[PDB]
Design an enzyme around this catalytic site. Sequence first.
Site, short mmCIF file in Angstrom:
data_model
loop_
_atom_site.label_atom_id
_atom_site.label_comp_id
_atom_site.label_asym_id
_atom_site.label_seq_id
_atom_site.Cartn_x
_atom_site.Cartn_y
_atom_site.Cartn_z
N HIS A 1 2.10 8.06 4.53
CA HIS A 1 3.01 7.73 3.44
C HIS A 1 3.51 8.97 2.66
CE1 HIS A 1 -0.62 7.20 0.80
NE2 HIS A 1 0.18 7.85 -0.05
N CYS B 1 -4.53 11.02 -2.67
CA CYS B 1 -4.42 10.60 -1.27
C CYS B 1 -4.59 11.76 -0.35
CB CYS B 1 -3.13 9.84 -1.00
SG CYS B 1 -2.92 8.39 -2.05
N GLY C 1 -2.16 11.38 -6.60
CA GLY C 1 -2.28 12.72 -6.05
C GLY C 1 -3.54 12.91 -5.23
#
Lengths: 304, 304
Positions: A41, A145, A143
């Site tokens: 993503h 991920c 932030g």
Amino acid sequence: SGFRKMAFPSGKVEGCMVQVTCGTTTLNGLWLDDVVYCPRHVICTSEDMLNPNYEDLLIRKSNHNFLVQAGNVQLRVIGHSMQNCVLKLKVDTANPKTPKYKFVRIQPGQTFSVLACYNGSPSGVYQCAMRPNFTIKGSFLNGSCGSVGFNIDYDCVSFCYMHHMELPTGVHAGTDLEGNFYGPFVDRQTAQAAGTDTTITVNVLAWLYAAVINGDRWFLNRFTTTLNDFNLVAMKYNYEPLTQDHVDILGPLSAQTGIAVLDMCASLKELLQNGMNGRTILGSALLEDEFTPFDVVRQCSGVT
Amino acid sequence: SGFRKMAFPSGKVEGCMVQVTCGTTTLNGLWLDDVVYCPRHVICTSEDMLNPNYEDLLIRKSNHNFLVQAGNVQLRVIGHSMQNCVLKLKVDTANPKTPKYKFVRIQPGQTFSVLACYNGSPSGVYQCAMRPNFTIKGSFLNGSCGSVGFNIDYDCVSFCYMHHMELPTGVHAGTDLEGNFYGPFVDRQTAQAAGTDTTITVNVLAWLYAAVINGDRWFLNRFTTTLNDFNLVAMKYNYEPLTQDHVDILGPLSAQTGIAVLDMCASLKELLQNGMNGRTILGSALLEDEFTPFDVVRQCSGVT
Ligand SMILES: CC(C)OCCCN(Cc1ccco1)C(=O)Nc1cn(C)c(=O)c2ccccc12
Ligand SMILES: CC(C)OCCCN(Cc1ccco1)C(=O)Nc1cn(C)c(=O)c2ccccc12
């Protein structure tokens, strides 16, 4: 003596963290050899996240659209591919700090350490467990991920988790390092509910053994039980069923303490039925389930 | 979201751990620049520990009697000195992995991470706090002496603790990096009792703010209190007195949540008086006191 929720030393994993940016989306990546692994993503805009078609969105991205920064230096991306929910960015430089490693897919109840990171920089390390509903209870802000979960066996890091998402209830979901989500979760901003978060019985028993080893013995009762009788109680209290495989794994703890596994099950059965009565075990007022039997042996023996 | 007991990333400290051996006694040392710091009881035999005269025992030791091993390679000792309860071994090589560092002496209630080590090798990392009785509740086995406690501010490691001892009750005692013990403890095998382990009130309040930030709000009551009224309750429950300095430190958490510090004190007062009633806050069935207000801000904001 003393028993703590202990994470693995994070140094070997710190040396692998990088920042990955695609367009205006930034998250963490894991650089091992000449490949950087990150959640797919990173290619999405906020609008895309409602119903992304990753294969389609990826067509609009070239190698030069992925910015990989290791420290304050830029890595050259020379290839990219999508494997399930992760992107693998081939870079022109092998990570000089690459430790010996493996990618492992863990089972529910297994514990691991998470190195929470923001902008490719480590913020902290904590220990958690893959819940029986395939979520984890982490500590992740926007932030984070791409932060990873791992275990260490002497000098080899076994990476087992990459952070992708927070469910609307504040619990976390992610994938193994092959990009396959744990549980039924998908990387899309659609409300996804978690199943029952049952207690990891074999881990509670392991922690009761750790408590006896360290001198907290008040809960030891004069009873025994059978696997079938114990499991009737476990079902009532939303505890995972105990199998003979779990009993086998507790063998070394039973041998060290001289407390038969089924006797410890009977003590746990009484704790479930009577409660703690305002008492604590290893400084906790509830039954801890994020220590595996192997974690207890490791901590109580001093494996480095 | 989510709130975890988080330790600092341990990599910068892992690169400093060495093994120190003197005669037949082995423990951990901390190598910074060209100095290795370790507990002075590395010079003692088991018999010496009952009533050691360190100055006398040290006379029988030369530079070549201290074996310092960093990884699988030996460091040359070219000087040695005793500073309070630590030995400083001057080596001929500066640690190439020396991070930016400071030595700090922390106050009770302050938290820090411990990198537990055995034979100079890291085994795990956990977060703990200097108790108000100047002990720590760690997880240390034989061979863990010389393991250190630290905090990290961006790229600078502030070393605050070196492990020396376990009291007969299983709690831990140690020194700052200047060799001064926290509390009244001495490095001698004589029974030493700890004082009252009171609860760190300002840290419990900080953790109640963390709970509100993450959505656990059931405990928020309709009351307020004063510092003097709250402190009458704090004394009854063996909680440290709350000062205006503690109120000042909680200011940013009060501002973010809109909950006045004295209102949170009144909610904590009711929790102390009524108990939890079988409920949990941030997954705990007791009031957590090993998060400082700064730890809560750091974790809830994502400082790296
Ligand atoms: C499903 C998981 C992986 O991500 C959840 C979060 C997804 N992001 C962040 C992100 C990742 C990549 C690019 O942006 C995001 O912006 N979603 C939102 C989309 N849209 C259209 C909204 O209106 C909205 C409103 C409030 C909060 C979030 C969103
Ligand atoms: C006070 C702290 C620092 O050390 C406590 C532990 C001290 N050690 C270990 C050590 C450190 C350096 C050299 O040995 C130790 O061996 N003490 C004991 C001494 N004697 C004489 C005993 O008979 C004995 C019996 C049972 C257990 C321990 C001991």
